[PDB]
Amino acid sequence: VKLVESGGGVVQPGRSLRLSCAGSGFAFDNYAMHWVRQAPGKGLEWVAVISLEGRNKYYAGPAKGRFSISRDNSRNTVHLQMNSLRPEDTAVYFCARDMGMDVWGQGTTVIVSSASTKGPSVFPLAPSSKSTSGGTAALGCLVKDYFPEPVTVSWNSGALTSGVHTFPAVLQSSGLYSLSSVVTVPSSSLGTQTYICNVNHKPSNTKVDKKVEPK
Amino acid sequence: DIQMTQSPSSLSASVGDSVTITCQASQDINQFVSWYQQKPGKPPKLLIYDASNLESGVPSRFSGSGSGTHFTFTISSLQPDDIATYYCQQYENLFTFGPGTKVDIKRTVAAPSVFIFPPSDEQLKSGTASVVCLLNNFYPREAKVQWKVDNALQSGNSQESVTEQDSKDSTYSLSSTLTLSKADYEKHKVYACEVTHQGLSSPVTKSFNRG
């Protein structure tokens, strides 16, 4: 059994997007289907349900009459059209089947924003005395002002993993994202070992290797 | 409509301890609940339905009991893969998820190692300045970062994010960046990040002078 969501992407506030959900592994008509969404860092929010043969529809408050959940028991698919999306609708959108919700999909991400696709500027977070503590130095890369997610970061092409912390991104007031990735290394290694953060922003076709040297 | 409470908001227990978590309804929902476990970046996993019926393949150490208004999901012996957020959900009428409850492993308190980074000269050429404060390898998760610029409390012009509990030392790390215009940056002298944490008897302050 398997649910596979589709759709997803950057669409402007007020504009339209349709989500699809293909279900392999069982007779689709036996279960009611759900759509459940999850905003970045927030809990599950139930969107809507479709009865096993499509007669009974029920939505949640935040739907507010803008969404429509339908079903195709012959193609084993459910859909969810989103006609006038608000940035408040940014979330991962999950599929689930119900008589409890035992089977879920991996989810598809709806990004609703007027920001244009943009690759990050990678600024050093240079290690200094004020970034040092008893022989341990901290250094990193500020991956600033990119859209949309995701961005990946490794260090020295993956040869450096111990002491790496690549933090969740944040959505700036400008609507562009920004994340940091920091490593802790021995202080005495600063003048000997080279520290490069390898940044990749595939939506903008931008790959940047940034060497981070002390001040 | 039907709205549900989840108490507590976060819980910490050691491996092998008994974890009990509560969920409440704005109605008598008898025993019509499910409970889900969700790990970072992953879809929810159904654990219990009808308040007490375990799903197939869910360990026997996961148990629940229910009573119309008051519901208890219990991990009777916490294992390391039980690190997750747990969500109760009603279906006595329609369906609503609770806010959820995070469960992490309890370890001894660890104060954060604080590091602060002035904005790079590369970025200053761009016309912006980001000041970054890093709080490293602390426990428990709760920490407060307070930005000051020549002692002024910055409020609303910073953003932060936290890692997940590290898989081998069980600590968290946090990074906060203060955004301000280059023109405002060049107008102030002392930039400080003042950390509050259970492991610190008094707030620790990391600061630098522009230049």
Q: How far is CA B112 from CA A94, B32, B132, B133, B202, in A?
A: 36, 43, 15, 11, 12
What gap in Å lies between CA A156 and CA A168, rounded to an integer? 20
Option in B87, B120, B161 nearest A44 (CB)? B87
Output the six-digit token pair for A65.
Answer: 């009459």
Nearest C-alpha of chain B: how many angstroms from A3?
11
* Residue B49 forms contact with A (CB below 8 Å): yes
* Residue B23 forms contact with A (CB below 8 Å): no
What single letter denotes the amino acid at residue B40?
P
Please, which experimental method was used?
X-ray
List where CATH 2.60.40.10 sits in chain B: 4-105, 113-209
What gap in Å lies between CA A193 and CA A188, rounded to an integer? 9
Residues of A whose CB is below 8 A from B87? 43-44
Specify the resolution in Å. Answer: 2.1
Closest-CA residue to B7 (of B15, B16, B19, B18) = B19
Q: How far is CA B60 from CA B48, B182, B194, in A?
A: 11, 58, 45
What gap in Å lies between CA A74 and CA B58, rounded to an integer? 32
Contact A69, A50 (CB under 8 A): yes
Q: What class does CATH assign to B4-105?
A: mainly beta
DSSP A209: E
CATH of domain A121-211: 2.60.40.10
Residue identified by tokens 């409890």 is: A100
Residues of A whose CB is below 8 A from B117? 125-126, 128, 130-131, 140
Output the six-digit token pair for A126.
Answer: 């240079």
SS (H, E, C) chain B: CCCEEEECCEEEECCCCCEEEEEEECCCCCCCEEEEEECCCCCCEEEEECCCEECCCCCCCEEEEEECCEEEEEECCCCHHHCEEEEEEECCCCCEECCCEEEEECCCCECCEEEEECCCHHHHHHCEEEEEEEEEEEECCCEEEEEEECCEECCCCEEEEECCCCCCCCCEEEEEEEEEEHHHHCCCCEEEEEEEECCCCCCEEEEEECC
In chain B, residues 3-22 whose CB comes closer than 8 Å to chain A = none
Superfamily designation of domain A2-112: Immunoglobulins (2.60.40.10)
Q: Are strands B10-13 and B101-105 parallel, antiparallel or unpaired?
A: parallel
Nearest C-alpha of chain A: how many angstroms from B116?
6
10 Å CB burial of residue B41 (0-12, 13-18, 19+) is: exposed
Q: First CA to last CA across chain B, in angstroms?
A: 57
B179: closest chain A residue by CA: A172
CATH of domain B113-209: 2.60.40.10
